A paper describes a structure:
The SHIP Ptase domain belongs to a family of Mg2+-dependent inositol phosphatases with specificity for 5 P dephosphorylation of inositol rings. Importantly, even in the absence of a localization effect, the C2 domain provides activating signals to the Ptase active site, resulting in a significant increase in catalytic turnover.
Co-crystallization experiments using the catalytically inactive SHIP Ptase-C2 D607A mutant with Mg2+ and substrate failed to reveal clear electron density for the substrate. The Mg2+ ion is on average displaced by 1.3 Å and the phosphate by 1.7 Å compared to the Mg2+ and 5 P positions in our model. As suggested by Mills et al. (2016) this likely represents the post-cleavage position for Mg2+ and the 5 P, since there is no longer space for the attacking water.
Author numbering: 421 to 673, 682 to 733, 746 to 830, 832 to 875
C-alpha cells in the first residue's frame, strides 16, 4: 500500500463503562470537522484509542473495541499493542492484512506526580513501523484545575523527556524527533480563561473563536513552552467538558468552566504526506461527563528494503559556552551512526548565541544501505549537535527528498533540546547515485 488511513480517538470515560454502541466515535460522526457525509464506511487501516478514567478492566476493554470494530467492519482487527497506567489506557488495532507489515513494536508509560492534588496523572505510549515509516502514539492525562497551567506544562516536559518509546540508539533524541509521525493526544486539561456564564453564552451561539482566543493550550503553544512545531486541526466543535450524564443538553456547574480538555496534536518529519480528514466530537455518547473526540489522518508510507556528501554545515546555537562542537548523524538508512570532526570556524556577536561552521573536510560521507532512488527520497537524517568536553545542545531532522542529485542543495531547519528552541542549522548537501 501507498497510503494508510489512521484513526485516533481520545475519551475521558468518567469512571463508568461505555454504552453498548460507540459507532459515532469510530466513524467520526458528530460535531466539528466530521465524516457525516460518508454513507458507506471505509474501514480505517489503523485504529488507535486513548482513554482516561477508564475503569473497565484492560482485557474486557480491548475485547469491547475488537467487538465494536468487528460489528462495524466485518473484520477481525488485530491489537498490536496495549499499555495502561492506572486508568490511563491506550490500545492500537490494525487490519488482519497489515499484520505482516508491522514491526519494531514498543510500549512505555510515565508517571508525573504533583503533591496535594489528585494524582494518577501521566502517560502511556505505543510505537511501531508500518513497512519503513515509524509511528508514535502518546495518550496522557495531565494535572487538572483552572490555575494549574504551569503544572500542566511541566507534566508535558516530563513526558517529553522520560517516555522511552522507540529504539534505544535514539537516546540523544526525545520522542518529538524519534518517529516519522507522532500523535500526542489525551486529557490535556488546559482550560478557558473566562467566567462561566460568558462561556455558556458563546457555546449557545456556536461562536467558538472568542473562546479559542482564551484557550490555555493555545496560549501556551504561542509562548513556545509546549508542543513546539506541532499541528492541531482547527476546532469547530463545542467544549467537551463538563456535561451532565444522560444528555448533551446541559453543562454541569470556576471549577466546572466548560473547556476543550480533550485534544489531538501531531508532529511529522518534513516533506511527508499527512492530511487531517476529520477532527471533532460525538454528541450521542452520554455515559461520561466528557464527550469522545475523534481525529482521522491520511498518511504516506514507504516500502521496506551511493553516498551522502556535505559541502558545509553552519549552526546558530543558543549557549554561553565557547568550546568546540561536532555533529552525530543517525538514520534508519545507515548501517552505523557517523560523527563529524571539530568545527573549524566560530564567531559570535551575541552573549547568548554562537555561530559554528564545519567545512567539507570536517564532515564525513554517509553510506546508505541501499542505492535505490525511490528508497532514498523517503529517508531522513537526525542530527545532534554536541560539545567536545561532552550533553546535546540541539537536535533536528533533515529530509533527503529534494537532495537527490549531482550538485549540492540547500537545507535549513530548527534546533531543539528539551522542549526549547535552541537555534537553527543550515548547510549544503547531495545524495549521489552512480
Amino acid at each position: 500500500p501507498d497510503m494508510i488511513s489512521v484513526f485516533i480517538g481520545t475519551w475521558n470515560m468518567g469512571s463508568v463503562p461505555p454504552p453498548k454502541n460507540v459507532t459515532s466515535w469510530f466513524t467520526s460522526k458528530g460535531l466539528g470537522k466530521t465524516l457525516d457525509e460518508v454513507t458507506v464506511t471505509i474501514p480505517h487501516d489503523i485504529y488507535v484509542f486513548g482513554t482516561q478514567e477508564n475503569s473497565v478492566g484492560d482485557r474486557e476493554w480491548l475485547d469491547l473495541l475488537r467487538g465494536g470494530l468487528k460489528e462495524l467492519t466485518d473484520l477481525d482487527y488485530r491489537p498490536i499493542a496495549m499499555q495502561s497506567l492506572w486508568n490511563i489506557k491506550v490500545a492500537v488495532l490494525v487490519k488482519p492484512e497489515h499484520e505482516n507489515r508491522i514491526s519494531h513494536v514498543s510500549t512505555s508509560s510515565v508517571k508525573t506526580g504533583i503533591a496535594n492534588t489528585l494524582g494518577n496523572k501521566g502517560a502511556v505510549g505505543v510505537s511501531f513501523m508500518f513497512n519503513g515509516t515509524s509511528f508514535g502514539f502518546v495518550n496522557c492525562h495531565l494535572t487538572s484545575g483552572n490555575e494549574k497551567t504551569a503544572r500542566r506544562n511541566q507534566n508535558y516536559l516530563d513526558i517529553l523527556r522520560l517516555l522511552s518509546l522507540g529504539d534505544r540508539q535514539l537516546n540523544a533524541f526525545d520522542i518529538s524527533l524519534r518517529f516519522t509521525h507522532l500523535f500526542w493526544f489525551g486529557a490535556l486539561n488546559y482550560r478557558l480563561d473566562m467566567d462561566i456564564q460568558e462561556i455558556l453564552n458563546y457555546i449557545s451561539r456556536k461562536e467558538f473563536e472568542p473562546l479559542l482566543r482564551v484557550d490555555q493550550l493555545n496560549l501556551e503553544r504561542e509562548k513556545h513552552k509546549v508542543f513546539l512545531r506541532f499541528s492541531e486541526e482547527e476546532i469547530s466543535f463545542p467544549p467537551t467538558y463538563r456535561y451532565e450524564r444522560g444528555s448533551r443538553d446541559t453543562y454541569a456547574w470556576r471549577t466546572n468552566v466548560p473547556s476543550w480538555c480533550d485534544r489531538i496534536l501531531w508532529k511529522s518529519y518534513p516533506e511527508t504526506h499527512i492530511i487531517c480528514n476529520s477532527y471533532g466530537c460525538t454528541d450521542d455518547i452520554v455515559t461520561s461527563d466528557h464527550s469522545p473526540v475523534f481525529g482521522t489522518f491520511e498518511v504516506g508510507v514507504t516500502s521496506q528494503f551511493a553516498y551522502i556528501e556535505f559541502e558545509s554545515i553552519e549552526a546558530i546555537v543558543k549557549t554561553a559556552s565557547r568550546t568546540k562542537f561536532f555533529i552525530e548523524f543517525y538514520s534508519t538508512c545507515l548501517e552505523e551512526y557517523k560523527k563529524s570532526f571539530e568545527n573549524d570556524a566560530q564567531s559570535s556577536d551575541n552573549i547568548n548565541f554562537l555561530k559554528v561552521q564545519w567545512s567539507s573536510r570536517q564532515l564525513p560521507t554517509l553510506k546508505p544501505i541501499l542505492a535505490d532512488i525511490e528508497y532514498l527520497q523517503d529517508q531522513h537524517l537526525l542530527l545532534t549537535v554536541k560539545s567536545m568536553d561532552g550533553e546535546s545542545y540541539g537536535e533536528c531532522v533533515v529530509a533527503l527528498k529534494s537532495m537527490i542529485g549531482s550538485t549540492a542543495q540547500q537545507f535549513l531547519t530548527f534546533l531543539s533540546h528539551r522542549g526549547e528552541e535552541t537555534g537553527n542549522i543550515r548547510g549544503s548537501m547531495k545524495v549521489r547515485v552512480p
